């Protein structure tokens, strides 16, 4: 049991992910060239990821000494930020997939629907729709002292008479409304998009527009796939533990989910020419 591994991972996230997501948000806000709908959704994704990387030193205080020394208000804020990130990331990815599906399979409605102002409104609606879990976690979050080991734990406090039923209900609802249904929507959208691409891959004929559209679609696909494989082990582990070396597997799943907040700027830099150019200009003007 060497504790510096996951702590070093957390620290690398805490710095690099914050720096990269801040750069992404600044580039999107500053340049008028980068004010597109998919870029607005990417801005929302970067905002959520940068918010979740601020609480990294508070996460690493567990697994180092296995207790919560930060108090009730900080526990509430941390739980709220975690749930906000979890819901907002997947909802923003679902809306990115839907936007790409509209841009690919319904180009006639893309001009009307894919304006950046509509993307901004959708981002606010996503943040407000995920606020049903953020505010709930603020209300229910707190610290309860263990009466068998004198260890303080930061988690949601459902009523004691029905803790077992409330805990299973919340974990089940989170699994279906934050993993299963959005993943099904993404899969349907991408199956239809692949079919349309291949069918027109016989006779697609507008060089610049088709090139840009397919490049951005590939970027969104890679981002969704990385999120999928980074957030799958933790969901399955939580579900299995709720229903049915384990602690070694438990904290590897938690750490793997948090590393997704740092890989998005790398993905944008490697898979987007405009983002790479903006990053180069910012680093070396």
């Amino acid at each position, epitope marked *: 049991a060497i504790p510096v591994i996951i702590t070093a991972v957390y620290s690398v996230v805490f710095v690099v992910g914050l720096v990269g997501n801040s750069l992404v948000m600044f580039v999107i806000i500053r340049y008028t060239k980068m004010k597109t709908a998919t870029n607005i959704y990417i801005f929302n994704l970067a905002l959520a990821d940068a918010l979740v990387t601020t609480t990294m030193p508070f996460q690493s205080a567990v697994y180092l000494m296995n207790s919560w020394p930060f108090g009730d208000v900080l526990c509430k804020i941390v739980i709220s930020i975690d749930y906000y990130n979890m819901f907002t990331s997947i909802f923003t990815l679902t809306m990115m997939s839907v936007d790409r599906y509209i841009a690919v399979c319904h180009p006639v409605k893309a001009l009307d629907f894919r304006t950046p102002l509509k993307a901004k409104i959708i981002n606010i609606c996503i943040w407000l729709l995920a606020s049903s879990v953020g505010i709930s976690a603020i209300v229910l979050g707190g610290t309860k002292v263990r009466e068998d080991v004198d260890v303080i734990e930061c988690s949601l406090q459902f009523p004691d008479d029905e803790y077992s039923w409330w805990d299973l209900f919340m974990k089940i609802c989170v699994f279906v409304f934050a993993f299963v249904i959005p993943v099904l929507i993404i899969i349907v959208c991408y199956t239809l998009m692949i079919l349309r691409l291949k069918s027109v*891959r*016989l*006779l*697609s004929g507008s*060089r610049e527009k088709d*090139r840009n559209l*397919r490049r951005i679609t*590939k970027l969104v696909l890679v981002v969704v796939a990385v999120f999928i494989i980074c957030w799958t082990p933790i969901h399955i582990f939580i579900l299995v533990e709720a229903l049915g070396a384990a602690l070694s597997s438990y904290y590897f799943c938690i750490a793997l989910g948090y590393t997704n907040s740092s890989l998005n700027p790398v993905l944008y830099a490697f898979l987007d020419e405009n983002f790479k150019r903006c990053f180069r200009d910012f680093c070396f003007p």
Partner: nanobody, 117 residues
Framework: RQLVESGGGLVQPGGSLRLSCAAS?????MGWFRQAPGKEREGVAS???????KYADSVKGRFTISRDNAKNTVYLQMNSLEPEDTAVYYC???????????????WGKGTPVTVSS
């Protein structure tokens, strides 16, 4: 990608020939162009993905072209070859490097064909 042509050989007048242009992720527009020594480049056939075929005025009624979508290869059939058809046939091809890549135009190396014996 690499474009390969074949089917160029010495043919007596009135004979028949079958060309072959292949590439080795999928081909969109695949045409056939002839270039005589004393003439500018001129297209003779152009087949789309759906099977639509276009022929030149001189090429009409004698030239047959079809597209094989399985192997992404074309054969174009010479009928009633004449010395006026002595030229080099170039394979103009439209293709995409990858499903998430731009559309590009591929030009074959060119094959020499002479109707003489």
């Amino acid at each position: 990608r690499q474009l390969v042509e074949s089917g160029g050989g010495l043919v007596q007048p009135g004979g028949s020939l079958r060309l072959s242009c292949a590439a080795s992720f999928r081909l969109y527009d695949m045409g056939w162009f002839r270039q005589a020594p004393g003439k500018e480049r001129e297209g003779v056939a152009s087949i789309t993905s759906g099977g639509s075929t276009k022929y030149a005025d001189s090429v009409k009624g004698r030239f047959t072209i079809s597209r094989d979508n399985a192997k992404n290869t074309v054969y174009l059939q010479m009928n009633s070859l004449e010395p006026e058809d002595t030229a080099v046939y170039y394979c103009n091809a439209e293709y995409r490097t990858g499903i998430w890549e731009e559309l590009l135009d591929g030009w074959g190396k060119g094959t020499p064909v002479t109707v003489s014996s």
